[PDB]
Amino acid sequence: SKLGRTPLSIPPGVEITIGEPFVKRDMTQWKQQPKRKITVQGPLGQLEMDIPDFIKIDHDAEARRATLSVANRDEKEQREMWGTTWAYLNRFIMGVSEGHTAVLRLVGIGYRATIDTRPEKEEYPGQQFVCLKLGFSHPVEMGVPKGMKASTPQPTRILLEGINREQVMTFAADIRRWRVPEPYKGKGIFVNGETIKLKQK
Amino acid sequence: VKYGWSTLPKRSRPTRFNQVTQGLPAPTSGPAAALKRREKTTPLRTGVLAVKKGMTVFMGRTGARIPCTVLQLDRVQVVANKTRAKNGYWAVQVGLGERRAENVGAPQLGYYEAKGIPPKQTLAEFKVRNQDGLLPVGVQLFPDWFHVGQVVDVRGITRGMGFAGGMKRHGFAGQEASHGNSLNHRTIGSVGGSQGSGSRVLPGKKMPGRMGAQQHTVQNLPILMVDNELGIVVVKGAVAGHKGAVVKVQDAVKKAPPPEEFVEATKQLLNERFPDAEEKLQAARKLHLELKEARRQGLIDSLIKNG
Amino acid sequence: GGLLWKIPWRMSKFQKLRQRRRLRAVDNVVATIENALAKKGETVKAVERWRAEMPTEAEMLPKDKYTIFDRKEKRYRKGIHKLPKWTRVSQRVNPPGY
Amino acid sequence: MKVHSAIKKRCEHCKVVRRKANKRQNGYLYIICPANPRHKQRQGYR
Amino acid sequence: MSQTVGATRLAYSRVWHHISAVTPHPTLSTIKAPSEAITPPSLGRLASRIATILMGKHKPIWDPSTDCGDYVVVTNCAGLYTTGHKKWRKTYYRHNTRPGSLQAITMDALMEKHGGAEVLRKAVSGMLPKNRLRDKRLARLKAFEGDAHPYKENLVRFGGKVVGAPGWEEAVKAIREADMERL
RNA sequence: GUAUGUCAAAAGGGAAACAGCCCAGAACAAGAGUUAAGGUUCCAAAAUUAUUAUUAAGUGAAAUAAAGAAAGUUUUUAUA
RNA sequence: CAGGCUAAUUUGCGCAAGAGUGUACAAAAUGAGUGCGCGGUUUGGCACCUCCGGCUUGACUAAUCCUCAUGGAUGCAGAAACUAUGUAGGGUACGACUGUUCGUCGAUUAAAAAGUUACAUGAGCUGGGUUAAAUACGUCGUGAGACAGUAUGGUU
RNA sequence: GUGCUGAAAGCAUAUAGGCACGAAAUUUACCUUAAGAUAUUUCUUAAAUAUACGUAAGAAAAUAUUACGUUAAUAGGCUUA
Ligand SMILES: [K+]
Ligand SMILES: [K+]
Ligand SMILES: [K+]
Ligand SMILES: [K+]
Ligand SMILES: [Mg+2]
Ligand SMILES: [Mg+2]
Ligand SMILES: [Mg+2]
Ligand SMILES: [Mg+2]
Ligand SMILES: [Mg+2]
Ligand SMILES: [Mg+2]
Ligand SMILES: [Mg+2]
Ligand SMILES: [Mg+2]
Ligand SMILES: [Mg+2]
Ligand SMILES: [Mg+2]
Ligand SMILES: [Mg+2]
Ligand SMILES: [Mg+2]
Ligand SMILES: [Mg+2]
Ligand SMILES: [Mg+2]
Ligand SMILES: [Mg+2]
Ligand SMILES: [Mg+2]
Ligand SMILES: [Mg+2]
Ligand SMILES: [Mg+2]
Ligand SMILES: [Mg+2]
Ligand SMILES: [Mg+2]
Ligand SMILES: [Mg+2]
Ligand SMILES: [Zn+2]
């Protein structure tokens, strides 16, 4: 992969900690493949993932860089996870330092949004609940997963924040699942600059 | 196989050796998995045994007229508790009525001897959700066990109808009456296809046979009246069986359990009406050993004529 | 048809091995007869015809040992085990191009 | 969506992908097109 | 007739063998190199070896009529090895003779109810002769999901070392050397 | 109709079961005898025997469903 | 007659290709004459085997009339409907006409869809059609008589 | 059918890998029958128990099933409402 070769510039403040090849015994499997626990701690938080053992990280603390490599480029399994493991570390490094954000735009007459607390259905103490008026008879209320900070600068604009991109973009898709953009009036929830082509009439 | 997908012998007992604490996946079958899938629908409290006394109507003070059945509780007592560590499921055994000692057998005479309860007429188990549903042994359950407006389920044995035909047993339409029919006015007709359908009567074919005298449940029957003195619990609707038959009454499974406050109030009333249900039980269990040890030795006659 | 003649369209690795040994055994019968005559300075017209227009098992293509030419087939080829008495009959040459 | 036995790209934006393939089924071949939704096609039957 | 005149007691005795469905088997594995790639015995390749033990065909006194089989304790059946996508694509069918009542279930759904031991009993069952000894032989297959079983004292031993243990082979060679000190 | 064979009047081994196909012509026994067709993980006598490639679909494994489609994969031949 | 083999044929379907229709624009819908197939429902072929509807009671199939989820729809504003992908759990009624399956019609309905099983089921029933002896009409035959012609009746 | 992350393939991609939504079908749940492990600080040393017989029945073609048999309201009679 042409992306796995590119070094990963570790900006000041971020710290990458590579574990050791370990195997969690699984009674359902006769042989588990070793993995490596990689922690990426920094100002905003800490993210952890387990990479296959065939991926080798040359963590250069001097130049603050870390290049990836596989034990065999001829195997399809190792070529794929090489680039996928790089794309994840890139997000982790750029998520714990700067952070990931998603913007949702509510188009449609009568579409509002507020961030209130619903102590009745709190999954964890202090859970924030996004309350959305989307034209349904009932109120649509969703609790932000633990680790995300949601705010609404304007009634028709939501701003999600978090260090885990996969979690942030996944939670923005659940909110969008209630009102998918329509092609006749543009009403719906658009995520991160998403647009829809309109019809003539 | 013999039953299901299991080819395991019938005398093998390997359950204790396949544990989830050893890293194995929780089985989908077995007592543990059964109780989880029925956790929501299992009642929280126990039930009572009542005798169907007849049918009537409940007249409201504003014009209402509601058909209902009168179920009388006769000396209903808690006889035993079934724990999950000793039996595999939660349940409470309840008794009804009385019986003459001579009719009761020695196996059952000693069963009640170790409890301090007079021999009962019938016994039945009522499954409960968890250990909180177990009650002290020897406490009587009165009609106030339920509250007016509470929905329950009534289980009873239907009226026996002997050998029934096809019309009464399976609602077969029958055949014509006068347009040429020969000897086939109430018969079942054809019983299947020919060679292409197996050359045999197919299993599960609806045919004449005995009808009735089987258990039937009526679900979601409210409680209109609750009278402790009369000992009756009036429920709306009909109930299976004949008058004088024993039925099982318990909270509905398809409805939310009664309020938490009620479940505690009823349990708190059993501690007042019977302030000592354990002291009388431990004394009975202490006497059973003394008499059981005398029967073994053969000196029971001395104890009988001791005073 | 309703009468079942369950003959597979292809041969097994066992039938192919014995077919190779039956072709190679008929090569030794023709070489033994041809060498025994050469010592006496004699020749047979049938032995000279065979060596001319018939190949040996080592000169045959895999498709010529296990298949024959049938004009009623999609690709003008038919399993050699479909020939009557194929085990005791000689068959090594097919029309050119097919 | 049009379920054909011969799926073909109808523009430069059409892509050939094999989706719904998992441990229980082999999946189908799809012609996904973000420009025109009328180019959606599938090969195979459930 | 001399060869069979003697004490046949121990030739007909039931031996309690043991095997783990997770331990790599260099003999019953199709991957024989490298050492780290040697897999355990597959379902059908383990079942074919077990059916041979249940029939007593590994003995020189085997007779199909006499039930000279042995016991086999198979452990770690939860990690039963399988290739391809058998676990989620193989189906087990059942019929009770009543039209409509065909019951199908996948290998993974059959391992959630009765564990991997049932999948192994079905394989060994179909590899046994279809006769009046099929249920007796299949009953001597005691398969368990984990490492725990009630036959840890029944397993055949040699000098205190259970067969298949780390040092069972050396314990056997030490007993036969003393056997040679006799006429 | 023709050519050839079998059955008919031919048992036995193989083709799951089999009048007609592949082997082979049964007077009767004995044998880890020697072989044909066919086969050798288990049912079930005999290889879980060796060498090199392909397939990941249980395709297939003793009765080939077609034209056709396609960033499935391998190899060869050009070519950047 | 039914079963068996076959599949020209069909009132049973599918896929490939795309003349053309669609104001525009091939594939929303539509699809000439064709090609490659599946299937065993119609009308047939062969000659291996043995010298009709209705009622009652089912079972199964899915190529779907309704009900549930859903893609496409210059031709999806909504609603209704069209086309297609999942899906056979339940339902698919009543009446007039005809011996009728079929077909036509009336009025309701969410809808009033099909097929296999000896075109399921007559040692379960019905016998109206069909199918003997009687009799008449028409037609044919010199005549006795005949008729995939029609009528009344005719031991299930 | 609809998604998030995301490479092989710098792009793209709900294709590999890691997660998710989603139907009157399925499974569970609900009801009946069958199954009969198990439980009781249960009984029994020639018994426990069951049957037979008699009055019956919530049972009923036979059978079976559920009660009772004088220390007894099982059936009939009688008395009252
Ligand atoms: K009559
Ligand atoms: K029969
Ligand atoms: K994407
Ligand atoms: K139940
Ligand atoms: Mg009665
Ligand atoms: Mg009637
Ligand atoms: Mg049969
Ligand atoms: Mg046949
Ligand atoms: Mg898809
Ligand atoms: Mg003759
Ligand atoms: Mg023969
Ligand atoms: Mg075979
Ligand atoms: Mg030999
Ligand atoms: Mg063998
Ligand atoms: Mg196959
Ligand atoms: Mg749409
Ligand atoms: Mg359902
Ligand atoms: Mg018929
Ligand atoms: Mg008949
Ligand atoms: Mg008359
Ligand atoms: Mg990407
Ligand atoms: Mg005891
Ligand atoms: Mg006695
Ligand atoms: Mg009687
Ligand atoms: Mg009286
Ligand atoms: Zn396109």
JSON list of N, CA and C in Angstrom, two decimals, chain E residues 62-96:
[
{"chain": "E", "resi": 62, "resn": "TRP", "atom": "N", "xyz": [-10.16, -58.21, 16.59]},
{"chain": "E", "resi": 62, "resn": "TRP", "atom": "CA", "xyz": [-11.41, -57.58, 16.22]},
{"chain": "E", "resi": 62, "resn": "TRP", "atom": "C", "xyz": [-12.35, -58.57, 15.54]},
{"chain": "E", "resi": 63, "resn": "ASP", "atom": "N", "xyz": [-13.63, -58.47, 15.87]},
{"chain": "E", "resi": 63, "resn": "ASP", "atom": "CA", "xyz": [-14.68, -59.24, 15.22]},
{"chain": "E", "resi": 63, "resn": "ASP", "atom": "C", "xyz": [-15.90, -58.33, 15.16]},
{"chain": "E", "resi": 64, "resn": "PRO", "atom": "N", "xyz": [-16.54, -58.19, 14.00]},
{"chain": "E", "resi": 64, "resn": "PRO", "atom": "CA", "xyz": [-17.68, -57.26, 13.90]},
{"chain": "E", "resi": 64, "resn": "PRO", "atom": "C", "xyz": [-18.84, -57.67, 14.77]},
{"chain": "E", "resi": 65, "resn": "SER", "atom": "N", "xyz": [-19.00, -58.96, 15.05]},
{"chain": "E", "resi": 65, "resn": "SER", "atom": "CA", "xyz": [-20.12, -59.42, 15.87]},
{"chain": "E", "resi": 65, "resn": "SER", "atom": "C", "xyz": [-19.88, -59.14, 17.34]},
{"chain": "E", "resi": 66, "resn": "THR", "atom": "N", "xyz": [-18.67, -59.40, 17.83]},
{"chain": "E", "resi": 66, "resn": "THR", "atom": "CA", "xyz": [-18.36, -59.14, 19.23]},
{"chain": "E", "resi": 66, "resn": "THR", "atom": "C", "xyz": [-18.10, -57.65, 19.44]},
{"chain": "E", "resi": 67, "resn": "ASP", "atom": "N", "xyz": [-18.58, -57.13, 20.56]},
{"chain": "E", "resi": 67, "resn": "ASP", "atom": "CA", "xyz": [-18.43, -55.71, 20.88]},
{"chain": "E", "resi": 67, "resn": "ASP", "atom": "C", "xyz": [-17.15, -55.55, 21.69]},
{"chain": "E", "resi": 68, "resn": "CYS", "atom": "N", "xyz": [-16.02, -55.52, 20.97]},
{"chain": "E", "resi": 68, "resn": "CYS", "atom": "CA", "xyz": [-14.71, -55.36, 21.58]},
{"chain": "E", "resi": 68, "resn": "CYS", "atom": "C", "xyz": [-14.22, -53.92, 21.50]},
{"chain": "E", "resi": 69, "resn": "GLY", "atom": "N", "xyz": [-15.14, -52.96, 21.47]},
{"chain": "E", "resi": 69, "resn": "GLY", "atom": "CA", "xyz": [-14.79, -51.56, 21.40]},
{"chain": "E", "resi": 69, "resn": "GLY", "atom": "C", "xyz": [-14.25, -51.04, 22.71]},
{"chain": "E", "resi": 70, "resn": "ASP", "atom": "N", "xyz": [-13.83, -49.78, 22.67]},
{"chain": "E", "resi": 70, "resn": "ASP", "atom": "CA", "xyz": [-13.27, -49.09, 23.82]},
{"chain": "E", "resi": 70, "resn": "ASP", "atom": "C", "xyz": [-14.00, -47.76, 24.02]},
{"chain": "E", "resi": 71, "resn": "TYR", "atom": "N", "xyz": [-13.67, -47.09, 25.12]},
{"chain": "E", "resi": 71, "resn": "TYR", "atom": "CA", "xyz": [-14.19, -45.77, 25.42]},
{"chain": "E", "resi": 71, "resn": "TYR", "atom": "C", "xyz": [-13.26, -44.69, 24.86]},
{"chain": "E", "resi": 72, "resn": "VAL", "atom": "N", "xyz": [-13.85, -43.56, 24.49]},
{"chain": "E", "resi": 72, "resn": "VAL", "atom": "CA", "xyz": [-13.10, -42.41, 23.98]},
{"chain": "E", "resi": 72, "resn": "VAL", "atom": "C", "xyz": [-13.66, -41.15, 24.62]},
{"chain": "E", "resi": 73, "resn": "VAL", "atom": "N", "xyz": [-12.81, -40.43, 25.35]},
{"chain": "E", "resi": 73, "resn": "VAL", "atom": "CA", "xyz": [-13.19, -39.18, 25.99]},
{"chain": "E", "resi": 73, "resn": "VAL", "atom": "C", "xyz": [-12.60, -38.05, 25.15]},
{"chain": "E", "resi": 74, "resn": "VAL", "atom": "N", "xyz": [-13.48, -37.28, 24.51]},
{"chain": "E", "resi": 74, "resn": "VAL", "atom": "CA", "xyz": [-13.08, -36.15, 23.68]},
{"chain": "E", "resi": 74, "resn": "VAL", "atom": "C", "xyz": [-13.39, -34.87, 24.43]},
{"chain": "E", "resi": 75, "resn": "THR", "atom": "N", "xyz": [-12.37, -34.06, 24.68]},
{"chain": "E", "resi": 75, "resn": "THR", "atom": "CA", "xyz": [-12.51, -32.80, 25.39]},
{"chain": "E", "resi": 75, "resn": "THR", "atom": "C", "xyz": [-12.32, -31.63, 24.44]},
{"chain": "E", "resi": 76, "resn": "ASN", "atom": "N", "xyz": [-12.58, -30.43, 24.96]},
{"chain": "E", "resi": 76, "resn": "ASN", "atom": "CA", "xyz": [-12.41, -29.20, 24.21]},
{"chain": "E", "resi": 76, "resn": "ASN", "atom": "C", "xyz": [-13.18, -29.25, 22.89]},
{"chain": "E", "resi": 77, "resn": "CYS", "atom": "N", "xyz": [-14.42, -29.74, 22.95]},
{"chain": "E", "resi": 77, "resn": "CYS", "atom": "CA", "xyz": [-15.26, -29.82, 21.77]},
{"chain": "E", "resi": 77, "resn": "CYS", "atom": "C", "xyz": [-15.84, -28.47, 21.37]},
{"chain": "E", "resi": 78, "resn": "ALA", "atom": "N", "xyz": [-15.75, -27.46, 22.23]},
{"chain": "E", "resi": 78, "resn": "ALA", "atom": "CA", "xyz": [-16.20, -26.13, 21.84]},
{"chain": "E", "resi": 78, "resn": "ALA", "atom": "C", "xyz": [-15.30, -25.53, 20.78]},
{"chain": "E", "resi": 79, "resn": "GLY", "atom": "N", "xyz": [-14.01, -25.88, 20.79]},
{"chain": "E", "resi": 79, "resn": "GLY", "atom": "CA", "xyz": [-13.09, -25.40, 19.78]},
{"chain": "E", "resi": 79, "resn": "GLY", "atom": "C", "xyz": [-12.88, -26.42, 18.68]},
{"chain": "E", "resi": 80, "resn": "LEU", "atom": "N", "xyz": [-13.95, -27.14, 18.35]},
{"chain": "E", "resi": 80, "resn": "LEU", "atom": "CA", "xyz": [-13.89, -28.14, 17.30]},
{"chain": "E", "resi": 80, "resn": "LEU", "atom": "C", "xyz": [-13.46, -27.50, 15.99]},
{"chain": "E", "resi": 81, "resn": "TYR", "atom": "N", "xyz": [-12.44, -28.06, 15.36]},
{"chain": "E", "resi": 81, "resn": "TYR", "atom": "CA", "xyz": [-11.85, -27.45, 14.18]},
{"chain": "E", "resi": 81, "resn": "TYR", "atom": "C", "xyz": [-12.66, -27.80, 12.94]},
{"chain": "E", "resi": 82, "resn": "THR", "atom": "N", "xyz": [-12.87, -26.81, 12.08]},
{"chain": "E", "resi": 82, "resn": "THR", "atom": "CA", "xyz": [-13.59, -26.98, 10.83]},
{"chain": "E", "resi": 82, "resn": "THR", "atom": "C", "xyz": [-13.00, -26.05, 9.79]},
{"chain": "E", "resi": 83, "resn": "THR", "atom": "N", "xyz": [-13.05, -26.48, 8.54]},
{"chain": "E", "resi": 83, "resn": "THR", "atom": "CA", "xyz": [-12.49, -25.73, 7.43]},
{"chain": "E", "resi": 83, "resn": "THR", "atom": "C", "xyz": [-13.60, -25.06, 6.63]},
{"chain": "E", "resi": 84, "resn": "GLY", "atom": "N", "xyz": [-13.20, -24.11, 5.79]},
{"chain": "E", "resi": 84, "resn": "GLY", "atom": "CA", "xyz": [-14.16, -23.42, 4.94]},
{"chain": "E", "resi": 84, "resn": "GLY", "atom": "C", "xyz": [-15.16, -22.63, 5.76]},
{"chain": "E", "resi": 85, "resn": "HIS", "atom": "N", "xyz": [-16.43, -22.77, 5.39]},
{"chain": "E", "resi": 85, "resn": "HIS", "atom": "CA", "xyz": [-17.54, -22.10, 6.06]},
{"chain": "E", "resi": 85, "resn": "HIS", "atom": "C", "xyz": [-18.57, -23.10, 6.57]},
{"chain": "E", "resi": 86, "resn": "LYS", "atom": "N", "xyz": [-18.12, -24.31, 6.93]},
{"chain": "E", "resi": 86, "resn": "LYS", "atom": "CA", "xyz": [-19.04, -25.34, 7.39]},
{"chain": "E", "resi": 86, "resn": "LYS", "atom": "C", "xyz": [-19.88, -24.85, 8.56]},
{"chain": "E", "resi": 87, "resn": "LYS", "atom": "N", "xyz": [-19.25, -24.15, 9.50]},
{"chain": "E", "resi": 87, "resn": "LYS", "atom": "CA", "xyz": [-19.92, -23.81, 10.75]},
{"chain": "E", "resi": 87, "resn": "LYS", "atom": "C", "xyz": [-21.22, -23.06, 10.51]},
{"chain": "E", "resi": 88, "resn": "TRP", "atom": "N", "xyz": [-21.26, -22.22, 9.48]},
{"chain": "E", "resi": 88, "resn": "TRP", "atom": "CA", "xyz": [-22.40, -21.35, 9.22]},
{"chain": "E", "resi": 88, "resn": "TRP", "atom": "C", "xyz": [-23.15, -21.70, 7.95]},
{"chain": "E", "resi": 89, "resn": "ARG", "atom": "N", "xyz": [-22.69, -22.68, 7.18]},
{"chain": "E", "resi": 89, "resn": "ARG", "atom": "CA", "xyz": [-23.32, -23.05, 5.92]},
{"chain": "E", "resi": 89, "resn": "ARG", "atom": "C", "xyz": [-23.74, -24.50, 5.84]},
{"chain": "E", "resi": 90, "resn": "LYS", "atom": "N", "xyz": [-23.28, -25.36, 6.75]},
{"chain": "E", "resi": 90, "resn": "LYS", "atom": "CA", "xyz": [-23.73, -26.75, 6.78]},
{"chain": "E", "resi": 90, "resn": "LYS", "atom": "C", "xyz": [-25.04, -26.85, 7.54]},
{"chain": "E", "resi": 91, "resn": "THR", "atom": "N", "xyz": [-25.99, -27.60, 6.98]},
{"chain": "E", "resi": 91, "resn": "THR", "atom": "CA", "xyz": [-27.31, -27.75, 7.56]},
{"chain": "E", "resi": 91, "resn": "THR", "atom": "C", "xyz": [-27.55, -29.19, 7.98]},
{"chain": "E", "resi": 92, "resn": "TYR", "atom": "N", "xyz": [-28.18, -29.36, 9.14]},
{"chain": "E", "resi": 92, "resn": "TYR", "atom": "CA", "xyz": [-28.67, -30.64, 9.62]},
{"chain": "E", "resi": 92, "resn": "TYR", "atom": "C", "xyz": [-30.18, -30.68, 9.47]},
{"chain": "E", "resi": 93, "resn": "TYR", "atom": "N", "xyz": [-30.69, -31.74, 8.86]},
{"chain": "E", "resi": 93, "resn": "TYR", "atom": "CA", "xyz": [-32.11, -31.89, 8.59]},
{"chain": "E", "resi": 93, "resn": "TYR", "atom": "C", "xyz": [-32.71, -33.00, 9.44]},
{"chain": "E", "resi": 94, "resn": "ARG", "atom": "N", "xyz": [-34.01, -32.86, 9.73]},
{"chain": "E", "resi": 94, "resn": "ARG", "atom": "CA", "xyz": [-34.73, -33.81, 10.55]},
{"chain": "E", "resi": 94, "resn": "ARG", "atom": "C", "xyz": [-36.18, -33.88, 10.07]},
{"chain": "E", "resi": 95, "resn": "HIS", "atom": "N", "xyz": [-36.72, -35.09, 9.99]},
{"chain": "E", "resi": 95, "resn": "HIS", "atom": "CA", "xyz": [-38.13, -35.27, 9.65]},
{"chain": "E", "resi": 95, "resn": "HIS", "atom": "C", "xyz": [-38.78, -36.29, 10.57]},
{"chain": "E", "resi": 96, "resn": "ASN", "atom": "N", "xyz": [-40.04, -36.04, 10.93]},
{"chain": "E", "resi": 96, "resn": "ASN", "atom": "CA", "xyz": [-40.79, -36.89, 11.83]},
{"chain": "E", "resi": 96, "resn": "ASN", "atom": "C", "xyz": [-41.84, -37.73, 11.12]}
]
